[PDB]
Motif scaffolding. Structure first.
Motif, short mmCIF file in Angstrom:
data_model
loop_
_atom_site.label_atom_id
_atom_site.label_comp_id
_atom_site.label_asym_id
_atom_site.label_seq_id
_atom_site.Cartn_x
_atom_site.Cartn_y
_atom_site.Cartn_z
N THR A 1 0.85 -1.02 0.15
CA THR A 1 0.19 0.18 -0.03
C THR A 1 0.86 1.27 0.09
N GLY A 2 2.13 1.26 0.01
CA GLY A 2 3.10 2.24 -0.02
C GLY A 2 3.00 2.78 1.52
N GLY A 3 2.67 2.13 2.70
CA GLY A 3 2.49 2.62 3.89
C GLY A 3 2.49 1.52 4.70
N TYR A 4 2.24 1.95 6.28
CA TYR A 4 2.01 0.79 7.18
C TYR A 4 1.19 -0.33 6.88
N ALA A 5 -0.10 -0.07 6.44
CA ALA A 5 -1.07 -0.96 6.29
C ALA A 5 -0.51 -2.03 5.14
N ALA A 6 -0.72 -3.55 5.31
CA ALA A 6 -0.36 -4.39 4.26
C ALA A 6 -1.43 -5.19 3.91
N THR A 7 -2.03 -4.95 2.96
CA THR A 7 -3.67 -5.67 2.87
C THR A 7 -3.88 -5.74 1.41
N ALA A 8 -4.37 -6.77 0.82
CA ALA A 8 -4.89 -6.70 -0.56
C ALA A 8 -6.43 -6.78 -0.30
N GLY A 9 -6.97 -6.49 0.98
CA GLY A 9 -8.63 -6.42 1.04
C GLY A 9 -9.20 -7.75 0.75
N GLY A 10 -10.40 -7.80 -0.03
CA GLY A 10 -10.96 -8.76 -0.39
C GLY A 10 -10.51 -9.47 -1.58
N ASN A 11 -9.46 -8.76 -2.07
CA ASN A 11 -8.73 -9.19 -3.73
C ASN A 11 -7.87 -10.37 -3.38
N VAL A 12 -8.21 -11.30 -3.02
CA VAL A 12 -7.53 -12.66 -2.31
C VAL A 12 -8.22 -13.77 -3.06
N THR A 13 -7.61 -15.05 -2.57
CA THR A 13 -8.06 -16.21 -3.05
C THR A 13 -9.43 -16.71 -2.53
N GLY A 14 -10.38 -17.16 -3.42
CA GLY A 14 -11.89 -17.43 -2.99
C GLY A 14 -12.69 -16.38 -2.88
N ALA A 15 -12.24 -15.01 -3.19
CA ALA A 15 -13.12 -13.80 -3.11
C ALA A 15 -14.30 -14.03 -4.24
N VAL A 16 -15.46 -13.43 -3.49
CA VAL A 16 -16.54 -13.55 -3.90
C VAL A 16 -17.19 -12.12 -4.60
N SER A 17 -17.14 -11.92 -5.80
CA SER A 17 -17.34 -10.50 -6.34
C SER A 17 -18.89 -10.31 -6.47
#
Ligand SMILES: [Ca+2]
Length: 352
Positions: free
Chosen positions: A4-20
């Motif tokens: 994220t270019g900052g302290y937060a390290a997350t891909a949010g819901g954009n991971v494996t098994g995500a439901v759109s």
């Protein structure tokens, strides 16, 4: 990619098994998240049952335009917002281009939440905590590429004479790692807290590539912890900028300040002043204050302004990976990358 270019390290819901899922309204978002807590047997799963990527396609311009035409009527109304409480599976809320919301996103005791491309403005219920974005007890949150706006004005007779509109991005509690990036924040009196009280100290937050225009204060109002602010464009700050309190530490680097009053200060407590490391900003020495129209004022209580424009403390090594462009490049290019409808584009040295 959890970068994220900052302290937060997350891909949010954009991971494996995500439901759109597609949400066409505020209520849809509420219903989708609620359904996302159920397993194959219809039983609830603590933290959520599966990851979610919600595309919000609704448009509330009508509500926004009517509110803009009558700002003093907003504070007394009921606040409107979607709460994301105790959802840890990973969730991303991204607005479709052209979408808009006259409701806020309140994150509580969650983690791995990403909010992107949302145009949120003129929220009702300023007197009842009608925040545009609230991050409470929530680590790994990424608030990126959103447009948060209202009117930088205080109507008469509002509670505490400070509730015409609430905040753009309030962070409090155990929201240990947060990244607020590429947002276009304009016409906001109280931009955002980093700690709700003198006791609510801590957290590691990064504010980068944000474009602030016509804002009064709290960029943020920091209570302890660490804050890394880089590549932001601060223009037309009418009250004060980064207010570092309760011994907080800030690394202020490669930012462009202009037409700002008290851009970097520590005031209102009268004690336990925070510190700042200044480096690479368009302002390099007091001589530059006149050049970029930087004004300073005093406070009734003991305070510290950065009027000498020198570093007053130290800052730990920045844990994450990042590479800032020059202050000049943010001034020249930032307005085209910050906000909604920029396809989540990022400012790189290449584009300078
Ligand atoms: Ca608030």
């Amino acid at each position: 990619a959890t970068d994220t270019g900052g302290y937060a390290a997350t891909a949010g819901g954009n991971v494996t098994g995500a439901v759109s899922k597609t949400a066409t309204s505020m209520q849809d978002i509420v219903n989708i998240i609620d359904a996302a807590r159920l397993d194959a047997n219809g039983k609830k799963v603590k933290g959520g049952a599966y990851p979610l990527v919600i595309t919000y396609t609704g448009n509330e311009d009508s509500l926004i335009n009517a509110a803009a035409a009558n700002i003093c009527g907003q504070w007394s109304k009921d606040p409107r917002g979607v709460e994301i409480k105790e959802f840890t599976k990973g969730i991303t809320i991204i607005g479709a281009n052209g979408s808009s919301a006259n409701f806020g996103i309140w994150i509580k005791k969650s983690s791995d939440v990403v909010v992107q491309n949302m145009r949120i403005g003129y929220l009702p219920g300023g007197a009842k905590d009608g925040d545009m974005i609230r991050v409470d007890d929530s680590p790994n949150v990424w608030v990126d590429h959103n447009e948060l706006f209202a009117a930088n004005h205080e109507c008469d007779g509002t509670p505490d004479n400070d509730t015409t509109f609430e905040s753009a991005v309030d962070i409090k509690g155990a929201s240990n790692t947060v990244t607020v990036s590429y947002n276009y924040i304009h016409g906001v009196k109280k931009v955002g807290l980093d700690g709700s009280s003198s006791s609510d100290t801590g957290r590691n937050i990064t504010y980068h590539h944000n474009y602030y225009n016509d804002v009064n204060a709290r960029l943020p109002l920091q209570r302890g912890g660490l804050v890394h602010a880089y590549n932001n464009l601060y223009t037309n700050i009418t009250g004060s900028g980064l207010n570092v309190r309760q011994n907080g530490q800030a690394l202020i680097e490669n930012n462009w300040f202009e037409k700002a009053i008290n851009p970097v200060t520590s005031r209102y407590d009268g004690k336990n002043f925070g510190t700042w490391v200044l480096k690479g900003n368009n302002i390099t020495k007091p001589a530059d204050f006149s050049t970029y129209s930087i004004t300073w004022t005093a406070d009734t209580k003991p305070y510290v302004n950065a009027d000498s424009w020198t570093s007053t403390g130290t800052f730990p090594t920045v844990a994450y990976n990042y590479s800032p462009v020059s202050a000049q490049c943010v001034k020249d290019k930032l307005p085209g990358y910050a906000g909604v409808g920029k396809n989540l584009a990022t400012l790189t040295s290449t584009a300078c």
